[PDB]
Amino acid sequence: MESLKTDTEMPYPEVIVDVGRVIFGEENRKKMTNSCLKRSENSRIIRAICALLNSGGGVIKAEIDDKTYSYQCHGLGQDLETSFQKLLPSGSQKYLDYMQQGHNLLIFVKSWSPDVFSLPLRICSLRSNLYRRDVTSAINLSASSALELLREKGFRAQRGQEEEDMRILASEFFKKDKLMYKEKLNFTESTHVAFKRFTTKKVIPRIKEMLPHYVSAFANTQGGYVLIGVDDKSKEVVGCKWEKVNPDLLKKEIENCIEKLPTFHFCCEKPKVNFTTKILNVYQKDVLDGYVCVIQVEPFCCVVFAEAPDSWIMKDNSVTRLTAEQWVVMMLDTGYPIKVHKFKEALQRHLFPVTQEEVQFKPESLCKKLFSDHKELEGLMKTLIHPCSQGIVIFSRSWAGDVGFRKEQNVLCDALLIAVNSPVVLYTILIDPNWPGGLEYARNTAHQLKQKLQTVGGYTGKVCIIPRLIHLSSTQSRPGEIPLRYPRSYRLADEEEMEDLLQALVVVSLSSRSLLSDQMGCEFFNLLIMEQSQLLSESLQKTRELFIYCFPGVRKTALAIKIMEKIKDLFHCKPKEILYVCESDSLKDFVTQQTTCQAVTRKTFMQGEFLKIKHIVMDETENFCSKYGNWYMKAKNITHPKAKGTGSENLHHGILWLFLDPFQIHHADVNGLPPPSAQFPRKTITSGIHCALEIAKVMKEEMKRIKENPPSNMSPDTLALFSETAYEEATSAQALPGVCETKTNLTTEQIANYVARKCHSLFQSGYLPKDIAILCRRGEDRGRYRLALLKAMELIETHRPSEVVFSPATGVWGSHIVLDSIQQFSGLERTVVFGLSPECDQSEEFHKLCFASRAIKHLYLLYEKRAAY
Amino acid sequence: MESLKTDTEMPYPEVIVDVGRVIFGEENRKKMTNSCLKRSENSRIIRAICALLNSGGGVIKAEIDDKTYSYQCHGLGQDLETSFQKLLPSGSQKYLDYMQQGHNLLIFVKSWSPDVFSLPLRICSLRSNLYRRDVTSAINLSASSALELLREKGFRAQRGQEEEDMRILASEFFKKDKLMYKEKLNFTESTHVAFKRFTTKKVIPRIKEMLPHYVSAFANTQGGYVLIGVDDKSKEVVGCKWEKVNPDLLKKEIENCIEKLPTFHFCCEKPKVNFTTKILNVYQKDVLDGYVCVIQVEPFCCVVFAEAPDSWIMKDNSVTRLTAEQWVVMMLDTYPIKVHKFKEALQRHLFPVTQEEVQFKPESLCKKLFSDHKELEGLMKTLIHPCSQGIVIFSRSWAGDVGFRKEQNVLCDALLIAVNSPVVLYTILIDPNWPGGLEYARNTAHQLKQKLQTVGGYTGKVCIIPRLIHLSSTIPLRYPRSYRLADEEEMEDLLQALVVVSLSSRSLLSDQMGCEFFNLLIMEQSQLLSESLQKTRELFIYCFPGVRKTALAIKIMEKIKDLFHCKPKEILYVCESDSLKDFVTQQTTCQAVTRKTFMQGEFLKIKHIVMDETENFCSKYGNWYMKAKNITHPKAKGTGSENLHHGILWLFLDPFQIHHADVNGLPPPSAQFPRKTITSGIHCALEIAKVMKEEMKRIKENPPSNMSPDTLALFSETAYEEATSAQALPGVCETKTNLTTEQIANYVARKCHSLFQSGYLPKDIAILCRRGEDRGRYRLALLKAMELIETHRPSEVVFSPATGVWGSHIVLDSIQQFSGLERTVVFGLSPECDQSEEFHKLCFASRAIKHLYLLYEKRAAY
Ligand SMILES: [Zn+2]
Ligand SMILES: [Zn+2]
């Protein structure tokens, strides 16, 4: 199966299992003469249901034999119901919904999501086929008891009396060499002896049919003796006729049966199941009559199966039985960030609120682009949605691409309608209605989206995504008829169900690469920064001077802003009494807009005099230069004032927090800081990493390269505090899927064309120009790159709606693309970063870190060709 | 039941139920003519099993009808086995063991401990009696499914289609006002309609019997209609004869039945179950023939029971059914964890399983008992034989050690734990003619097993066999072989359970394992605190009362030596008292001096300084802080030092226990940064911590002159409660008031004698007096009291100054001389104190680990 299988009559998104012709109805089921057909049909239906439960859900199609059968009047069938109850002890309503359309009965099977309150039963099984022996009975363990036994045996392996009277009597019987006719047994059945239903006219068939059960029961429990040749009622040694079957054939059949038994091993030794078969002779008046067989099974280290556990899955459009190995692996279960599942409720409440207002079109950016490019989309969608007042329509250029699958050019956009008391509907808009593959695209996209919701999102409920195909060129909406019918239980019923589906959509979007993924990632990062700021603020009451060491990608500035707010709250000071000192002007304007507290650059700080400043927070401390003056003593004097006699009854100490990034030092001169031995007390922050996995991986590779061959300016002691293990833990905890690409050996025109094409593609998907940052290492190439980019974007944008405007790094907050040097972009970040740098050898490759620290989710490093002289 | 009930014939420790005469055996069970007796006997046995499972375990005693019945030859019974396997789906062998002695068949029922791999099914139940309607069938939910439904409804309440076609047709049938004879229904049964087995000759008994099931099924699920008067096979409105029963009587019976139904509510509104009963008339050719009753049940917010859930417990020597409220509370469930974290290490250190000869524990009590009674060693060696591997744990009173009464006539109790042996509890009696020995042994064994299962968390079959012995002298209790310990792992698990039980009680063994537990906890805190060595160089550590600063300081010194690779003599400890100096000098290899020695001397090779008792430092000699800074923070001298180093200056501060009114010499509280507040260092009894918290509140409410508001601000009672709950252990704190000197001496002598008889060594007693000039008077009075009490007088009573804390003698010194040192038992002898001077309870309590006896002398008369 590449995508799905074609079914014109019932083009459902889900997988369809055809169980052939079945007889349905209580009266018809009872009056069936053929019991074999009854059992076969029941088995087919139950196997299909189990496979659909373990394979994500689906539809079962059955051709109804009687042409006068109505589900409302007749019913389903009693035996099928007993089977359903056996398979689903919790309840069959939560998973199975029935429907009669035409002459076909459709059973809708929900995916087996283990109930949070219930035991974590990963998969559903009819019978474990793991037998454990209670007193005088061998019980086919249920799924829950099977999990009990598996977990107990696993713990035992990983770690490293009248019952005994029955065992002793059975052992004494075993040791005996010969027996007498009508000799009376002095013991009955127990946990360690079983002899009932074992004597027949033909012993071989009964042994083959029944021995596996008792052998599994004895091996799983402790000990056991199986006796063949003892009459059930009278407990005498009747024996088996010698002429009927010789002892050697019976012994070989027994060893064959025990060898065919499936087994699963928790331990390393992996012993086979061991058993001793001893054949006893019975003599009436010293003439041979027959023989009695005793089988002894010792306790077995792990679980032994009577046969393959009859649990089914779906594999290659077919219902497939699960082997013991597969069953135990799937049952014992022997990684998207947890923070997503912690914050999905707040994210849904912020971005996708369930309100009684009119229908909302999201996301705003893509909606604006689509509606400006196509004027009829607003009207067409408003007409199609009607009648619906409450709901959200989530637009995407390609939902299939949004869930990780192929993107189709012929699909203009996809709309996902979520509403209360309505099914989820996926609208696919086509540029040309004559495109043959629209229906397949819609069906596959709906199937993939539902599967992603259930698997990644964690949705545990009945949801139907109905593929509806629409065209802009059509003057009249809803052409033809839509025959897709689902039970009323599959539409969302309350606002809580809508909230749950939207939270699952939040998780799915945050686990993928898309425009919506990027926007919700920004909101997620805001929440994470709030949590980190709250955690770090606890040091305000315990320290006054602190040296904060930050890994690459920590986002020091947001933490600094929120820490400044926390200082204002805690110390009850006026906002203008807190000073933020940075090195770059651009960061100064950024912070000036983001915070009400005072923000100055180092030159202003040294030139000016700050009498009213009570607390100082310094960022970009690595790049500070001491040529103008020694700023550290100034900050110390403003923060730590020496006592002047008795004038100050209670001298105060302020906050002198310095944020340092040892890795990104671009000033070879001395910083003016105290030596690394005097940089105490210190804190290392690793949990601020807010970027893509790809960008974090690039930054870690550069970190390792720097640590292996440290440069002159950096020192071993500062490099020692940063470990790769902590960086992996933080990245796995806090990073989101993204894009990082590298291109080499390109001319200026090729770089310009690549940037123009990528920007056009991103804009078509709903990215705004404020998310694009084009950064060049060498500042003298700004004009050349600007001319090349103007030419490229003019060529690409043939329609040319508005002029292309690039803004300097000062205008980060504005709505324009940023084209400036890396030095001018220090401390500032944007979602998409284009790094235009000349050809770099191994020595100069360290600037990948500088480029990556500026990118949040996209990073396109482009390298120019070597100049020819 | 005060302790237990007397059973001379079967004196088992456990609770015994008598299920009367029962017929046993497959042949006998099958051939029974009377089915009512069969059902009654099966019900009695299963109810007793359920009660024993939910009530800690016990024994079932059944008298066998047949005198020729042998369990091995015959068996137990098929119906009984099926009932057992119904009650225990996991397995009946783990909980039920059978045994035949005499004419009685005994069933040994283990306590229902929910398996760690299991769903948390707290109690066992035959039937939930909670019904959930699958389509066409109403199912009595199992215990697990009942728990699932209860949790779902609780979460829902706390938070705040052809099936639909069936419902619509049923609603249309409901709305109809008239019916025709042999009118064919156009619908069959679904999740929302049920009418099978409802039409009988006498409708009322069948309704009374079956209606609760369907009402519960409909209420628990969504909606439902019940139809009365429809023939099963042909689906036509046969109707109920009008003469047989009037509609009003049937309606009132339905209302009575529905009202009688038990219910449990997860919500505050508490609505009753709502339902509409409508009576429909059937006419054949317009003449009345009968009537049809339709009952509508709407979805109901909470769970509705068909009847009281048949789960039983034990209450007042009786098998008692559980009501719905009790069952739901017990099923939904609506001591420090560090004990369960450290019990394995504690048992490996203190009760190791080895192939060596049997070990007698604890050593102190064993020495006392064997010295006082010479024959006890030989008697125990004889009784234990044949046994090589095992531990014998001695107690003056195991009953007292598990919280129950102490008996004077019991010399001691020995608990024998061994592999391939039952646990045996030996009670030694001074006078063998004491009537109550057997009852004492039985009750003690019962209480010890119950404590093990409940507090200790033991999940396994254990038998504690009461055995009574007498020193002056020159058993029918039979348990299944599964009740004896089988492996070394089972012995280890039982020993871990015993460790938890004793750490959850008050005894000598409790105190010794408390000391080991506190050592492990201090190791964990020291490891956690040592992380600040890499992040800070000068630190001001603020400690709540009872933090045990000195042990943390010693382990921090060790961590400094490990981290900075410095010689032990390069790390310096500065304290104020000579006694703590000597203590630390013995406990550590690093240099330890007092403040006077620190200021007089010169320390060239010292690279790191750790200071304790910093609140009591006096600046009259000079500025010790500046000296510490100069030693730890050296100013650069030109280019001589290529890489200047900064040392560690860690100051341990206790703001509450400031006894020097003069300025400490510390920097002002605004310059005391960076700072750390240690809360998780509290290692004492709950009672001592409570006294310290009360004194803390009293001090915070009325702060004295020397302390400052900023210093008191960091100490909150929420943190103190969290710490005390996390890391404190049960203990004793007592206060006596208005006693004269000889009464105080007699009290101390009597308490010391009682503690010594229980195995306490003299090194665990510290007698501390607030006023130092009373030391001689108290010493004379205590010597007189102790010589009067110890009539035997084996050895002289020796009191040691506070310098000799490490020695094996009672300490009699002032509180000032005992600063920074602790002992298990502390006696506080102080004069009468008013509200202003009550603050010294904190000083007295900081010196006690598990026992504190504050004694106040009478006011002096002039
Ligand atoms: Zn194995
Ligand atoms: Zn309620």
Side-chain angles (χ1 to χ4, degrees), chain B residues 6-19:
Chain B
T6 301
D7 190 16
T8 303
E9 293 299 318
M10 312 275 288
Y12 282 74
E14 324 186 339
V15 72
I16 305 169
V17 317
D18 211 355
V19 291

Side-chain angles (χ1 to χ4, degrees), chain A residues 81 90 92-93 133-134, chain B residues 92-93 132-135 148:
Chain A
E81 266 261 1
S90 43
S92 52
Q93 30 269 43
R133 186 165 179 82
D134 279 37
Chain B
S92 50
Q93 30 266 61
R132 183 179 210 196
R133 186 166 177 81
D134 267 300
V135 54
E148 195 181 39

